[PDB]
Design a protein around this ligand. Sequence first.
Ligand SMILES: Nc1nc(F)nc2c1ncn2[C@@H]1O[C@H](CO)[C@@H](O)[C@H]1O
Ligand SMILES: Nc1nc(F)nc2c1ncn2[C@@H]1O[C@H](CO)[C@@H](O)[C@H]1O
Lengths: 331, 331
Amino acid sequence: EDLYFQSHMTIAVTGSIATDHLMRFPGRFSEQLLPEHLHKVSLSFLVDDLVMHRGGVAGNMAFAIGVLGGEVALVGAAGADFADYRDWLKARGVNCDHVLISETAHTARFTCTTDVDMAQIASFYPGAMSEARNIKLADVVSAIGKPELVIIGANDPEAMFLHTEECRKLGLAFAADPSQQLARLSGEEIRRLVNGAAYLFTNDYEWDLLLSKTGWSEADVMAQIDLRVTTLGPKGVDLVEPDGTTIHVGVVPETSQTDPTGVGDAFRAGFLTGRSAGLGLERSAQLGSLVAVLVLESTGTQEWQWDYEAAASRLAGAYGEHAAAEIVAVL
Amino acid sequence: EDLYFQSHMTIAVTGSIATDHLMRFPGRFSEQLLPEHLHKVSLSFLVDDLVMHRGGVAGNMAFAIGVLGGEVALVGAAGADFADYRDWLKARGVNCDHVLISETAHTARFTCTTDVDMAQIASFYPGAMSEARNIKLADVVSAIGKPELVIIGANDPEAMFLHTEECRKLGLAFAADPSQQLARLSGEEIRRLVNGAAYLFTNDYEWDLLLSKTGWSEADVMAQIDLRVTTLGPKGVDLVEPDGTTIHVGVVPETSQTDPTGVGDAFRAGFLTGRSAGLGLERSAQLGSLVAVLVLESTGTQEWQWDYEAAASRLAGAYGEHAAAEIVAVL
Ligand SMILES: Nc1nc(F)nc2c1ncn2[C@@H]1O[C@H](CO)[C@@H](O)[C@H]1O
Ligand SMILES: Nc1nc(F)nc2c1ncn2[C@@H]1O[C@H](CO)[C@@H](O)[C@H]1O
C-alpha cells in the first residue's frame, strides 16, 4: 500500500526510444524460408526503399497517448541527440522530463525490413538504451506522483526487470509489454516480468513464443495477471480474464497495408487511453483498433494524424453507431 | 568465337561493392522461428555489437584474388565515397579502373545480424549499385582484353542478367554466382543466369532455393553447366560434373567461429585462383577451404591475413603433405 500522492491520472511509459530505419522487400519472406533450412538460416533481402522515422516502443506509445489527449510521462534512455525528438514529443503533450540523456552513447537504432505480406525482420542496436537500467522509477514517482499505470515495454533487458520490481515494491499497477524483446530474453527473464501484471500485451506469435520459452501453460499465466490482451493480426484482438471470460474485437478494416511498424504500440496506447477514461474492455479495444489501423496506413510509427470526425465515422463503420458515440465522447 | 586478344589471365569480378554493418545476436535465430508462424514472421533481435567493414561480393572476391596474387579487375557500381575503398583494394593488386562511380547515389549498405550458430539475416540497400546495369562489359574487354573468366556475383538484378548476356555474346567463360540475390530474383530471373555457365556456385540452402524457385530438377541444371560447386557448411564442398562424377572436399577445421560473412566469397576466390593456376578440382577446393576458414576466423570479409608458411602448415594438417605442397607451389 503506497501512501504517496496520486499523479492523477498519468500513464508512465517505460521502454525504448530510438531512430527507426524502415525498408521494404518487394517479395515474400516465407517463400525464402525453407522449413528444412530453418535450423540455420542464411537470408539476405535486397530492399527497394529506406526511410528514417522517430521510434522506440515507449516513444511510440507516449506519442499516441499524447495525441489522444492523455497525460503521459516518457521514461527511457536516449543519446545527446534526443533534444530534437523531445521537441517532437512535447508538441503532442508528452512529459519528457524523466528521459535519461547519455553523456557518451548514441540513441538506439532499429533497422527493419518489411515484406509484401507485412512480415518483418529487424535488428535493434541499443546504444544509450542500455543506460535505462540506471533510471529509478522511485525518482519519477517522487516528482509527479503515483501513475495510474506504468507500461513496461521492450527496453534494456535488465531495465525491464528492474522497472517491474520497482513497480512491485512501490505498489504501482503495471502492464507487462515485453513483445519486442521476447527473442532476446531467456525463459527465466520472461517469467519474472509477468506476476501481478494488470495487463499482459502480446500478439499471438509472441504469446506462443512466451509460453514456449517460459515452459508455462496458459493457465500458469492467467493465474498471475489481471488480463491477457493478445492481438490476432487481421482477426482482431482477444481480451481474456483469468476465468477466462473472453471478449473479442475485430479489426477496423484497412484501406492499405502500408507499414505495420508500431501498430501494436498504437493499439496498446489507444486501448489504455480508453481504459483510463473509464471505457470497458470492448470499447477500449475498439478505440485501440482504430489508432492501430491509422498506423498501418502510414509509414513510420508516429506519422499518423488524428481527425475526431474521421475517427467517429470509421468507428461507426466497423463497430456501429453505439461504439463510435461512446468512444468519441470519452476523448 | 571471340577473336579479340586474351587479357591473360585476368578474372573479372562483377557484383556488389558495399559497406557492411555487421552485428551479433547473442541467442539463436532458430529458437525464435516457430514453424507455425513462419507464414508471417515478426522478428526483432537486440544485438550486442555493431562494426563496419568493406564489403560487397565483388569487392570481397576481388580482394582475395588479389591477396593470393591473382590478376583481377573489379567491375561494379559505387558511390563517390569509393575513392578510399579503391585505395584499399589497389593495395592488394586489384584493378579498379572499371568501377562505375555514381554522380548522385551512395555506395550500397549491407546490414547483417549473426547469431550464436553463425546463422545470418540481413538487408541490402542498393544505392549506387543499381547503376551497375549501365556498365558495359564490352568496354572492359576492350581495355584489358578477354578475361579467362567473368564472375557474375550478386548485383543489381538487371545488371546480373545483362552481364551474363554480354558474356554469352562475347564468348567469355562465366561463373554464375547468384547466391546472395536468390531471395530477390524470380524463378524466371534465376533461370536465365544459368545456361552455359562454366561454374555454378551456391551453398546447399541456396541450391534448394534455386531448384525450388526455378522449378528445375538437378538434372535440368547439370545439362546446362560445366560444373556445380555446392558448399556444405561444416561438411565441406561438393564439386559435381554433369555426369555426375562428384569430388568432395571437407572443411579446414576452424579455431573459432567468429563471423561467417564473406566465407563463400573467399572460398570462391581461392578455388578460382586455384583453377587459374592449373590445379585440379580437389586441390582448388582445398585452397578455397583455407581462405574460407581464415575469413570465418576474422570479423569482416577482407580482414584476414595471408601467411604463406601458416597456410602450408594448415593445409598439411587437414589434407596431408601432398595437397599442401602442390597448392603452395602454385602460388
Ligand atoms: N528488440 C527491440 N527492443 C526494443 F527495446 N525496441 C524495439 C525492438 N525492436 C523494435 N523496437 C521498437 O519497436 C517499435 C515498434 O513497436 C519500433 O519503433 C522500434 O524502435
Ligand atoms: N542481397 C545482396 N545483394 C548483393 F549484391 N550483395 C549482397 C547481398 N547480401 C549480402 N551481400 C554482400 O555479400 C557479402 C558477403 O558474401 C557482404 O560483404 C555483402 O556486402
